[PDB]
Structure 1
Amino acid sequence: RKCSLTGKWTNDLGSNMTIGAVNSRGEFTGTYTTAVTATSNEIKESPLHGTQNTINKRTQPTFGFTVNWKFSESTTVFTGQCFIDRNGKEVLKTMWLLRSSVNDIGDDWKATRVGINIFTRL
């Protein structure tokens, strides 16, 4: 009854991710294949790097990771918690910030989008 991040996951938009073994410092690496984009930039699998919080041997740890898109100048970060829901089943409930690139610091105000994603095992 630990919710583990490692493994293969799919979210509510159709995107898939893989997360490998969580190491000695709570660190993990993975891959991210989004089902949605918004420019003639064609989707490609992109790496992610992140950590899970192991404070107090928490059975439902918090975590975060960054997606380093290999088809966009943008970055997304995701943060959430791994739950064991009503059916003994694992869910990652996350929110994200997607930072776009702007040309001038005066345009910074409009550069950051926000949303949610729920992941379940694939």
Structure 2
Amino acid sequence: CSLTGKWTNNLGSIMTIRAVNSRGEFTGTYLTAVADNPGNITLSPLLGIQHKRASQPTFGFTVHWNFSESTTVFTGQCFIDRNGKEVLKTMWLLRSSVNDISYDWKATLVGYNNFTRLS
């Protein structure tokens, strides 16, 4: 269950993840299929850490959107079924930029995503 490779989720987004180093750290690139303003979407870098020893590791990563002031974090676990098929089960928080601390209450969206490997 190395996060290295190419993935798609239930919203149609795709991400590519590079080699996971000995500390479990990885970089990659995220293409979201959806956005507040979808006409603005550009490829956005991600940076995260997975656990290394576990066969079905937990992990987290941050996506710095390159077309928005927002940021998303994803966390989840990679599972392997009896046929060797991998799924990333994740939850996410999406932080929007607000003007000052008095607007903080409305700044964080939550959701889920299930990822599978592209071919």
Asked if these proteins are the same fold (TM beyond 0.5), I'd say yes
Kept in 2: contact 1:41–1:72 (CA 8 A): no
1:106 to 102, 106, 113: 102
1:79/1:105 Cα in 2 relative to 1: closer, same or farther (>3 Å)? same
Aligned to 1:43: 41
Measured against aligned partners, the alpha-carbon deviations of 1:12-36 in whole angstroms (never above 9, x if no partner) come to 0000000010112110000000000
State how far apart, in whole Å, the 1-side matches of 2:115 and 2:49 are.
17
Identical counterparts, % of pairs: 78
Stretches of 4+ aligned residues off by more than 4 angstroms = none
Structure 2 length as normaliser, TM-score? Answer: 0.95
Find the counterpart in structure 1 of residue 60 from structure 2: 64
Partner of 2:90: 94
Give, in whole Å, the separation in 1 of the partners of 2:78 and 2:18: 15
Deviation at 1:40, TM superposition (A): 6.1
Unmatched runs of 5 consecutive residues or more in structure 2: none
SS class of match (1:106): helix
In the alignment of these two chains, the number of paired residues is 118
1:53 offset after TM fit, Å? 1.5
The CA RMSD measured in Å over matched residues stands at 1.1
AA at the equivalent of 2:80: I
Counterparts of residues 4-19 of structure 1 (less than 5 Å): 4-19=2-17
**Please, what TM-score do these two structures have when normalized by structure 1?**
0.93
- Structure-2 separation of matches of 1:40 and 1:49: 22
